[PDB]
Amino acid sequence: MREIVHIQAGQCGNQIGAKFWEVISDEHGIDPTGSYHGDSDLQLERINVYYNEATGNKYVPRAILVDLEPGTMDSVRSGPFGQIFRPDNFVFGQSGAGNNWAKGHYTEGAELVDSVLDVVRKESESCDCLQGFQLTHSLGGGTGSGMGTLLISKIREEYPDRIMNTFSVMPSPKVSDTVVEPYNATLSVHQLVENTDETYCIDNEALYDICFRTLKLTTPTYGDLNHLVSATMSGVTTCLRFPGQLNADLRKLAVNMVPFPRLHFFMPGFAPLTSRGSQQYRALTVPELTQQMFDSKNMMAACDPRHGRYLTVAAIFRGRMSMKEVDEQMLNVQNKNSSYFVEWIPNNVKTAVCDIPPRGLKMSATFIGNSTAIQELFKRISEQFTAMFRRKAFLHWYTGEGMDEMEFTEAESNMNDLVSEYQQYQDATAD
Amino acid sequence: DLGKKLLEAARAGQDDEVRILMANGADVNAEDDSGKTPLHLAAIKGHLEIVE
Amino acid sequence: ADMEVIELNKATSGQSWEVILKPPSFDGVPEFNASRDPSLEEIQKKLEAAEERRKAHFAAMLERLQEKDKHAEEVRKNKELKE
Amino acid sequence: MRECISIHVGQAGVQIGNACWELYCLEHGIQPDGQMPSDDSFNTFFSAGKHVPRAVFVDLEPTVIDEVRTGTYRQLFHPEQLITGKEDAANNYARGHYTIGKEIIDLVLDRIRKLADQCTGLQGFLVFHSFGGGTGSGFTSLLMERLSVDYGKKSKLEFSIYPAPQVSTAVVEPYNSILTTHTTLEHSDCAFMVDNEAIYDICRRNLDIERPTYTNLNRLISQIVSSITASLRFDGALNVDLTEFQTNLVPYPRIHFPLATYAPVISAHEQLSVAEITNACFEPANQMVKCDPRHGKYMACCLLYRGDVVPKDVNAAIATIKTKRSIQFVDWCPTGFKVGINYQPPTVVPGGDLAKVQRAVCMLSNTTAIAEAWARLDHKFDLMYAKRAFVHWYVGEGMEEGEFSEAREDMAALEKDYEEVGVDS
Ligand SMILES: Nc1nc2c(ncn2[C@@H]2O[C@H](COP(=O)(O)OP(=O)(O)OP(=O)(O)O)[C@@H](O)[C@H]2O)c(=O)[nH]1
Numbered sequence: 001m002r003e004i005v006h007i008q009a010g011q012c013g014n015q016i017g018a019k020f021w022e023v024i025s026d027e028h029g030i031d032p033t034g035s036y037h038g039d040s041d042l043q044l045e046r047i048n049v050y051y052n053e054a055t056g057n058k059y060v061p062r063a064i065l066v067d068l069e070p071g072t073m074d075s076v077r078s079g080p081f082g083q084i085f086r087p088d089n090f091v092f093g094q095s096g097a098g099n100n101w102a103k104g105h106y107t108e109g110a111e112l113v114d115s116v117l118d119v120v121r122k123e124s125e126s127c128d129c130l131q132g133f134q135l136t137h138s139l140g141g142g143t144g145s146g147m148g149t150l151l152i153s154k155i156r157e158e159y160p161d162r163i164m165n166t167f168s169v170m171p172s173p174k175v176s177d178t179v180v181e182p183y184n185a186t187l188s189v190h191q192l193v194e195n196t197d198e199t200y201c202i203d204n205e206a207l208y209d210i211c212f213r214t215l216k217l218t219t220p221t222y223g224d225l226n227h228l229v230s231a232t233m234s235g236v237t238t239c240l241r242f243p244g245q246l247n248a249d250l251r252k253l254a255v256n257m258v259p260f261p262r263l264h265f266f267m268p269g270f271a272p273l274t275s276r277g278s279q280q281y282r283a284l285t286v287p288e289l290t291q292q293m294f295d296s297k298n299m300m301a302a303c304d305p306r307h308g309r310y311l312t313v314a315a316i317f318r319g320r321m322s323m324k325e326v327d328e329q330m331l332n333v334q335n336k337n338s339s340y341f342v343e344w345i346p347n348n349v350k351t352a353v354c355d356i357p358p359r360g361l362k363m364s365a366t367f368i369g370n371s372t373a374i375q376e377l378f379k380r381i382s383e384q385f386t387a388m389f390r391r392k393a394f395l396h397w398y399t400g401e402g403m404d405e406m407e408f409t410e411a412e413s414n415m416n417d418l419v420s421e422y423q424q425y426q427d428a429t430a431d
Numbered sequence: 432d433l434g435k436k437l438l439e440a441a442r443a444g445q446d447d448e449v450r451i452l453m454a455n456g457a458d459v460n461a462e463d464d465s466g467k468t469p470l471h472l473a474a475i476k477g478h479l480e481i482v483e
Numbered sequence: 484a485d486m487e488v489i490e491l492n493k494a495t496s497g498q499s500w501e502v503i504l505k506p507p508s509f510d511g512v513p514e515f516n517a518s519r520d521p522s523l524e525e526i527q528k529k530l531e532a533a534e535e536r537r538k539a540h541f542a543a544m545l546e547r548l549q550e551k552d553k554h555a556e557e558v559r560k561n562k563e564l565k566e
Numbered sequence: 567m568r569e570c571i572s573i574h575v576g577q578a579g580v581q582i583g584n585a586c587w588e589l590y591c592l593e594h595g596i597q598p599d600g601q602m603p604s605d606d607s608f609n610t611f612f613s614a615g616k617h618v619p620r621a622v623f624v625d626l627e628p629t630v631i632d633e634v635r636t637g638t639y640r641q642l643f644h645p646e647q648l649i650t651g652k653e654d655a656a657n658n659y660a661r662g663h664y665t666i667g668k669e670i671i672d673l674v675l676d677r678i679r680k681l682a683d684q685c686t687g688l689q690g691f692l693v694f695h696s697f698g699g700g701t702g703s704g705f706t707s708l709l710m711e712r713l714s715v716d717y718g719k720k721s722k723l724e725f726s727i728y729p730a731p732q733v734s735t736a737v738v739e740p741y742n743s744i745l746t747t748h749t750t751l752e753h754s755d756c757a758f759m760v761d762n763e764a765i766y767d768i769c770r771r772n773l774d775i776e777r778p779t780y781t782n783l784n785r786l787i788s789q790i791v792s793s794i795t796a797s798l799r800f801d802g803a804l805n806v807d808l809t810e811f812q813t814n815l816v817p818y819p820r821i822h823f824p825l826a827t828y829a830p831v832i833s834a835h836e837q838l839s840v841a842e843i844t845n846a847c848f849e850p851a852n853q854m855v856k857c858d859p860r861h862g863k864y865m866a867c868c869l870l871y872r873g874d875v876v877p878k879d880v881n882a883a884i885a886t887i888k889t890k891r892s893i894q895f896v897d898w899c900p901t902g903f904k905v906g907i908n909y910q911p912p913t914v915v916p917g918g919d920l921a922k923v924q925r926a927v928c929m930l931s932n933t934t935a936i937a938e939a940w941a942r943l944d945h946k947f948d949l950m951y952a953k954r955a956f957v958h959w960y961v962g963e964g965m966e967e968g969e970f971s972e973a974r975e976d977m978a979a980l981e982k983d984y985e986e987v988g989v990d991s
């Protein structure tokens with residue numbers, strides 16, 4: 001029954017992974033003990049995608065929790081829903097990665113990886129028909145970045161015919177001052193380009209700017225940043241968790257969204273944007289929903305969608321609304337904004353509508369775009385990487401772990417190639 | 432309270448906001464969650480005039 | 484007025500007939516394509532060829548992933564040389 | 567003793583089959599438990615007084631067929647003839663034909679064989695499927711190949727769902743459509759294309775349904791499919807056997823795609839006359855496939871009436887239509903019509919959107935204008951193929967890039983066949 005295995009690695013991966021489970025649990029009527037208490041049958045129809053049914057009619061997330069930082073286990077277990085997670089699915093080390101990709105990928109991470117693979121093997125074999133995997137992690141640290149990409153690679157060896165999907169948090173010096181974050185992110189992107197089928201680019205630069213400029217928060221905290229992350233993750237997974245026709249599984253989503261294998265980095269967006277504690281006085285109209293979710297101020301990646309073209313788009317509308325009005329509005333943005341949509345992929349914008357809205361909203365909309373403007377995110381990381389790399393800055397922290405400088409050169413070149421490929425398709429014409 | 436505001440302005444490069452907070456009596460050696468003062472933050476972010 | 488009704492059939496719950504308004508102008512059978520037997524052995528040969536192409540694709544991917552594993556062991560051994 | 571086996575492949579074929587068998591039951595007085603309390607010509611479609619449809623439902627995933635074995639007709643079909651896999655073809659022709667097709671083709675053929683064993687004079691198959699689905703496109707062509715080997719002398723009719731962007735679920739549906747059409751072209755004797763946009767526009771315009779759903783579409787589709795099979799299910803006089811559709815509608819083997827036009831489609835009103843409904847058969851807004859037959863030429867035209875229809879009125883309506891309209895035929899074809907009246911009245915689903923009519927008509931014509939539907943699909947194939955967009959999904963499954971060129975070259979050849987048949991002298 002199309003099961004997904006969820007994996008959360010590192011401090012960021014576990015923080016956003018926990019919020020994902022707290023949020024989707026509420027939507028499905030599942031309390032922290034695993035009991036169901038809802039009104040709608042749509043809540044449990046596809047509960048199997050993310051939850052295992054344990055004895056006593058309980059539901060337990062098909063989630064594996066990983067971190068080299070031992071202290072992460074306590075913070076996850078102490079969360080509102082820490083009780084729901086399978087105890088044996090918590091795999092924690094004693095020595096962290098110290099913001100070092102090489103430690104997470106090659107040394108401390110490699111020491112712990114077989115313990116994680118044992119637990120993913122067990123969840124995977126228990127599946128009636130496994131779809132693939134979903135990894136939440138950051139790219140700026142050491143565990144989520146290095147060990148997360150090591151896990152992806154090992155999982156790909158045993159399950160090569162399954163979808164590998166990630167929620168990858170991109171670093172921004174606006175939220176983190178760690179000097180080596182561009183190194184860790186470039187090394188991770190190199191891995192993601194080769195080994196994932198679809199990746200959602202949750203950019204800390206866009207999240208900080210949404211909180212500061214749009215939500216008017218003088219100093220956004222990780223809670224503020226993560227409110228946007230969970231709201232995004234709920235929206236982008238709605239099609240997988242509820243009964244529907246379009247993009248109902250990770251494979252059908254990838255066939256619709258990815259025309260060229262490497263070009264699988266999605267720009268997520270949502271509407272209405274809200275802060276924690278902001279009440280909704282009235283529901284947005286379908287034209288407000290459609291206009292806002294396509295707005296650059298609503299994107300979760302710091303890229304201007306009007307600086308590129310949309311290869312493909314998935315629009316998900318949640319709540320009770322007119323489908324005729326939705327269709328009209330979706331045709332309206334494409335006909336009015338025709339120059340930001342590739343003309344050589346006919347009917348590249350697919351729209352789904354789910355009757356169940358998210359918490360505190362009567363109407364909402366989530367956007368998923370595969371845009372050539374995503375090169376703005378990669379160019380920003382590449383520039384930061386190059387500034388340090390030309391000075392051979394901080395390399396001993398990586399080569400001291402056994403790494404070769406040639407790996408940095410290879411990763412830089414691969415990400416720069418990815419950027420040229422987006423530009424090639426942006427300039428392509430339907431001759 | 433002014434110490435938190437002084438640290439945000441030092442990190443954000445707001446030269447005029449720092450000048451105003453200084454005149455209003457903010458603590459120059461106010462520390463963040465890591466023991467960093469506004470000088471550490473202006474030094475990390477490269478705001479020369481704020482350092483001066 | 485130039486209608487020719489040819490009664491075809493009359494059944495328990497039906498009735499059929501043809502109504503000819505005009506005969507064909509081209510007095511003959513023309514050539515355009517005018518058209519043999521596919522075998523099970525031929526079908527299975529093409530299906531097996533695709534099955535092996537897919538298998539080769541997965542084997543190439545696995546070989547690439549296993550080379551990453553050899554590299555990782557080299558990295559681990561290189562750290563050991565230092566400390 | 568002239569049985570027909572219905573085969574429903576993928577979601578569209580299964581859901582259309584549900585609507586079709588639902589209407590067959592109402593038209594033949596068969597209850598959802600197979601019992602009929604009330605001519606035995608219905609025995610061609612239905613085998614202790616229980617009447618089981620001679621149908622097989624196949625889907626690579628179970629959610630759609632699970633609704634069938636749970637719904638109001640859960641006792642109508644035998645459990646054996648509802649076949650489902652665990653993993654669908656993910657909107658990929660290569661998965662449905664090569665990767666996942668290989669695993670259940672033998673099981674599907676075995677189930678079909680069990681229905682063929684119950685037949686003392688099997689006429690052939692009616693295959694319902696989408697063009698755009700992975701199963702509808704990939705599994706159907708795989709099945710069509712096998713059916714030609716195992717049942718060589720039997721006829722094979724199609725009811726193919728042509729893609730519309732309003733209800734399209736995959737960007738690669740033009741790829742799947744060209745790939746399936748190319749590979750099943752040699753194995754289909756007559757194929758009734760059902761353009762989802764033409765059906766969608768009829769529901770919006772004639773039924774005033776703001777935003778039509780598959781339920782609204784399938785009820786309309788079933789109404790037309792029922793008109794086409796009424797001849798085989800009741801003791802009619804036109805199209806009494808599956809071989810009669812090739813005789814009446816397809817003059818050349820590759821040009822086997824007749825256009826179906828239905829009238830009247832009325833929202834659930836003075837009764838429309840024979841002349842009024844016969845005139846609607848020549849209006850393009852009432853067709854199954856969007857195209858303009860006024861620009862092209864005809865090679866066959868059949869008028870299939872139902873209900874209170876007097877042959878005297880049919881002949882008068884045809885007489886006026888020739889003198890008031892321009893209905894050109896190809897040089898090598900006689901300009902004329904094969905008429906058939908099926909005394910059985912038009913039946914609608916009690917709660918449905920369509921209204922009960924005293925009389926209805928379905929015109930089946932072989933026009934060169936249907937090539938417009940191929941041209942539209944071929945254009946979308948070309949826009950993507952020029953950049954090899956999404957092709958990696960097919961190649962990764964073991965398919966070769968050359969198969970795309972092969973299928974597209976066959977489509978250009980088909981468009982060129984419609985062109986040749988249509989010139990003068
Ligand atoms: N009219 C009609 N079209 C349908 C229906 N269901 C799906 N479609 C159309 O069929 C196409 C999608 O193919 P499906 O039939 O859903 O796919 P499938 O054969 O199950 O194949 P996979 O899901 O890829 O295994 C699109 O063009 C849809 O609009 C239905 O009930 N009626």
Ligand SMILES: Nc1nc2c(ncn2[C@@H]2O[C@H](COP(=O)(O)OP(=O)(O)O)[C@@H](O)[C@H]2O)c(=O)[nH]1
Binds near residue numbers: 097138226
């Ligand atoms: N959005 C968000 N980013 C986070 C969070 N925690 C850490 N990060 C970011 O992740 C990076 C550091 O990685 P982290 O997950 O702490 O390291 P790891 O434990 O070694 O994987 C920096 O770019 C942080 O800004 C969080 O809760 N939310």
Ligand SMILES: [Mg+2]
Binds near residue numbers: 576577654701
């Ligand atoms: Mg399907």
